[PDB]
């Protein structure tokens, strides 16, 4: 790892620590989970997602190179990646003990039923769980995890990106930092084809993004559902 690559990693780790609270303190402020419209978990999960978008923005701002992109390109990258980075960053609370996201409260332990009660079907939910499990099984170090989120966000192939050459240059610098980290630090057998496996997770995220988008488009078209969404969610997923 070069001095620059070490600095990239330190910046990303700090950014994550500043935008991911592992105590889940802020969750009391969300509208309450209702588990008893049948979309009873829509308000709570809308608030959780809206909060998560704010954190992804805060993280992206710190990725080296990101703020040198035009405003338009920064916006395109964030609107297109937000759901994906949310899925990635949620892996940190995900637990293979019961295939749930454990966020420090009995009622903030989210399961497949919860996501269905925000309007989603198993067409999204089952691949989502498979994704979380596969990702957990990679046993990523925190450095690998934050690099992967950064690479996800800085993707030159997102629809509407203007300066794809600059976005690619930034992404390749992050990708090379990741490959060097794996070579230098990740022990066998976990390191074997790790970079490839991580790149595959990015491809899996594109598929989950497409399905989430389709389902979101449908559920949000119902004014009773849309009225329960936050302005930020409406804008970012719109």
């Amino acid at each position: 790892l070069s001095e620059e690559q070490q600095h990239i990693i330190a910046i990303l780790l700090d950014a994550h620590h500043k935008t991911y609270d592992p105590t889940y303190a802020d969750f009391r402020d969300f509208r309450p989970p209702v588990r008893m419209s049948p979309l009873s978990m829509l308000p709570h999960l809308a608030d959780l997602v809206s909060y998560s978008i704010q954190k992804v923005i805060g993280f992206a701002k710190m990725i080296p190179g990101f703020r040198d992109l035009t405003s338009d390109d920064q916006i395109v990258l964030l609107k297109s990646s937000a759901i994906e980075v949310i899925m990635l960053r949620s892996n940190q609370s995900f637990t293979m003990d019961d295939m749930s996201w454990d966020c420090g409260s009995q009622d903030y332990k989210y399961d497949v039923t919860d996501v269905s009660k925000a309007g989603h079907t198993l067409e999204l939910i089952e691949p989502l769980i498979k994704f979380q499990v596969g990702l957990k099984k990679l046993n990523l170090h925190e450095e690998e995890h934050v690099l992967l989120m950064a690479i996800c966000i800085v993707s030159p192939d997102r629809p509407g990106v203007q300066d794809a050459k600059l976005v690619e240059a930034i992404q390749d610098r992050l990708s090379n930092t990741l490959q060097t980290y794996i070579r230098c630090r990740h022990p066998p057998p976990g390191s074997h084809q790790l970079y490839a496996k991580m790149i595959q997770k990015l491809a899996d995220l594109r598929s989950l993004n497409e399905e989430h988008s389709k389902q979101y488009r449908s559920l949000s078209f119902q004014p009773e559902n849309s009225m329960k969404l936050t302005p930020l969610v409406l804008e970012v997923f719109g």
């Binding site: 923005i57 405003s71 920064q74 916006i75 964030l78 804008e235």
Partner: peptide, 9 residues
């Protein structure tokens, strides 16, 4: 709107 305003600078 909200995104642009947050990213402004």
């Amino acid at each position: 709107p909200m995104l642009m305003n947050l990213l402004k600078d």
